[PDB]
Amino acid sequence: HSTAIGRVWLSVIFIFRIMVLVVAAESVWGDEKSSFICNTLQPGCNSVCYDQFFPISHVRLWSLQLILVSTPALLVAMHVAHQQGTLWWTYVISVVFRLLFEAVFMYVFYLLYPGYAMVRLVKCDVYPCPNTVDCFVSRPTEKTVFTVFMLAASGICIILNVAEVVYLIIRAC
Amino acid sequence: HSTAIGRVWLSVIFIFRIMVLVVAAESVWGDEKSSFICNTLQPGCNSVCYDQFFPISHVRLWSLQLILVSTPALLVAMHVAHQQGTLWWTYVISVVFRLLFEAVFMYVFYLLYPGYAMVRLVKCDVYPCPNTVDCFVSRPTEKTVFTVFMLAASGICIILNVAEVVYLIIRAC
Amino acid sequence: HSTAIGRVWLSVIFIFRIMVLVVAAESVWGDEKSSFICNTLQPGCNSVCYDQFFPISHVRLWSLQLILVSTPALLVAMHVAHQQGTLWWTYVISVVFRLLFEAVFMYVFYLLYPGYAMVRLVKCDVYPCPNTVDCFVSRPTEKTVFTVFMLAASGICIILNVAEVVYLIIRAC
Amino acid sequence: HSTAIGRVWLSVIFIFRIMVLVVAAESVWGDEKSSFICNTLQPGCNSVCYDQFFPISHVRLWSLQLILVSTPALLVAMHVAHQQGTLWWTYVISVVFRLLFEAVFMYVFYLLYPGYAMVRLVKCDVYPCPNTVDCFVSRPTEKTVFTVFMLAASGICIILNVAEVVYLIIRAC
Amino acid sequence: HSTAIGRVWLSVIFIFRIMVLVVAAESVWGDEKSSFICNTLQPGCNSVCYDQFFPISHVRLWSLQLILVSTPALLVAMHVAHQQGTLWWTYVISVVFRLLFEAVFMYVFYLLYPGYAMVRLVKCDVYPCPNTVDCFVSRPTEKTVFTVFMLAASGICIILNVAEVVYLIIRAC
Amino acid sequence: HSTAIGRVWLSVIFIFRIMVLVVAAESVWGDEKSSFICNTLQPGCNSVCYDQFFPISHVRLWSLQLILVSTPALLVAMHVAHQQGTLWWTYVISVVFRLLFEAVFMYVFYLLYPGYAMVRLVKCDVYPCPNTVDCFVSRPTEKTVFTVFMLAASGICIILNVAEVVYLIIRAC
């Protein structure tokens, strides 16, 4: 029932995000916290500083995004298999929710990590760490590269979803 | 035999909980105890303080909940395959037990963790740790985010199960 | 050839034990010995004290129990597939051996771990540890919770197997 | 083409050895060398003492044994599938080689580990460790229990293979 | 629709790259950063020096390359399955993009790692490491061997893709 | 199209090498470098000495050998499936290349590791390690046993491949 821009391109880009996330989950972000060390001798400051600068990691943000993005698609597949009416409205609503999930997660990424580029050193000033301590991020450049790849793919998904809605509206009218 | 509110929505939400739990099991809670350190030099206080504040972890609580929730569904599938009567009563009983398991595990979550928000620092006062020691939770914010997601999905399951019972009762009458 | 009490309930409970054991194997008991530390500075006392108090871990005891319990079931399936007589006697013998394996492993659990509740601190007095040393068990409460779940499921299996034998005897007579 | 004593019992026991070995490979013998510590401060003596007392571990000895035992069975299956004559001689030869592999590996186990019972402490006197040092085996009792299970299953395989040869000879004559 | 030089040789070489990358991902590059130590006592200099000399690791560069190389192939397969016109132009465009991805990633490898040979010692001069510190690469020779294998396979892919384009053009004309 | 000596024996031996390599990859060679320690206090000498004495590990040498050995077999399978002429010449060429790969990798094993027997202690004299330092190999005897098994299987493959060529030549003439 889908048009060519979402049947082929959107599915392939989604598979691309799946494969990239799987590669970068255990490998790039495997030692995100274990190798996250701070210049201070205060016990327990590695954990609090890591949590302060990484409230939720990129992989798990992308993992949650991919699950949320695929949820309307899973709903349609579950709904179609059980019904088998006007399923066109159901599909366009699912695409709209998919677009909203992409936009929301991209905006969440902007809020959580202002500036899509990891930095080697982060200035951590939180209890119990005295004054400001220097904590070092594991693989900042590698994480930045995969962040650019995932964000670019997400932006492509946003554009493709918008084109999907426009194409379906034009098809209806 | 199920209605639309449980055939599609409840199944999709259950799959959502499965995928989120799988993502958050090895990744978020992988280093829950290894990186759980306390400010004291007393040997063995990391283990006792972790056990005191985490009698059972969220992932394993959710893992047990998902197994328990799916158990009445597994019973019906096993019963139907072997019988192949009035299976409607069997299904509604399974839904009621599924609702009870969701409510019980949510209440257990309330008892074990009063306040659905991890804190960076926990005040541990237990033998052999002298007086009160400061122990630090690994990824408190990330665990809090996944706790909110899982609890929200569980609440949706509770609402959907209640709607399932009401819809079936209305269908019968 | 089986009756309803073992065809459905016993199989589901067995699957429940499988899923719970898989969840609790790598997660709960993954760091049973690595995080098992003692208050003494004597080298090698962590290993000997862990072995003294845990001659065989609960997961491996349950893993061996599940393999042993499923062995008569595997024998019948292997025997039936190769024969395809009076297979009723073969089935009831397999159920009896399954019941005996459940009872033996439960009794073994009683002998190895008198008192089905882990304790945070264990008093270890064994060579080369001088006098008595304080060793700390990893996740004592979480292991206790899963021990209760597994033992309760095993007790249900014992009751269901006894009911299976009684039902088959009543059916024959 | 096989008789009942090897078609059912031998196959089930082989599956039992497979399942037990898989359970005991990553779990029991996972930390065989990492947690193998010696009482000396001499660097590198943990490795040489572990190698001296464990030239080849039980799991890998059993893993090699299971591969070798299944090799004549794999040869027959490969030979039959490609031929599809007097395959009875081929089968009995495979059983004889299977029996020889079981006996050889059991004898190898006797030579490598005289006395089928792990000991907590081993007296290591090898370069560069000065004089005799005390090294501690990880999970000696748990490894002993699984050693007894595997050796008992191997002995059952030896008896079943001998019965297989005798039954086939009686069938021929 | 493909000719023999790409249907057989290109596919086999791609499978060769997949298998080699899988073997060398967890094994060779598993401890790339954990065992990457520097001669300095400055905290956090292992991470910054590793990132400076390895902005993105070879395995993840190859993993991204393989995903990108297979993307036009995945697009054609997705497009063909949904269409089922002049698909010859679509295929040759996919081959051209595949060739460009191979060339771009090979050039990226040249830029990121000038000189396709790992060195045991790297001179790291970056904040906060004082002056120049000596950092040691894990398995430099083994990584060099797999780098040569992967680059040689990539060069073969480039040559085969060029031959694919030439053969198709000759076939058309 | 293959004769009996390569259809059955060569395939079974190849499967034997696959299973042995899989068993010995994560288990025997899992801690090859992590537990490779040297008697010196010079930082970074564990890595350089390990690389000096193990330019490429046995498992990865065998993994590359198995991929290379199976490559001509994969080429024939890919070629046959796409053609479906004189495929006999193609098969014998593949066998010859398979024999050459076996011989080349065995000779490479001789060059990289002169003497097919691991030694507990290796005399490392390389920068920055001062003079000659004593480094200890992890599981030298266990690695030696698996080296003998793999080399013996490789020698059997060489003999079987030579017999395959001779048998095919005799069949043609």
Author numbering:
A (entry chain A), B (entry chain B), C (entry chain C), D (entry chain D), E (entry chain F), F (entry chain E): 16 to 99, 129 to 217
Extract from the study:
Two HCs at the surface of the neighboring cells can dock in a head-to-head fashion, forming gap junction channels (GJCs).
However, an additional density element was clearly present in the pore region corresponding to the previously described lipid-1 site. We interpret this density as the site of MFQ binding, and thus this region of Cx32 is referred to as “site M”. Upon addition of MFQ, the only change in Cx32 GJC density occurs at site M. This density is large enough to accommodate the quinoline part of the molecule. However, there is no clearly defined density which fits the piperazine moiety of either (+)-(11R, 12S) or (-)-(11S, 12R) enantiomer of MFQ, both of which were present in the sample. As accurate positioning of MFQ is not possible, we modelled the MFQ based on its conformation in a complex with Cx36 GJC, for which a high-resolution 3D reconstruction is available. The site M is formed by I33, L36, V37, A40, E41, S79, and I82 of one subunit, and M34 and V38 of the neighbouring subunit, and is thus largely hydrophobic. Mutagenesis of V37, a key residue located in the site M, renders Cx32 HCs and GJCs insensitive to MFQ-mediated inhibition.
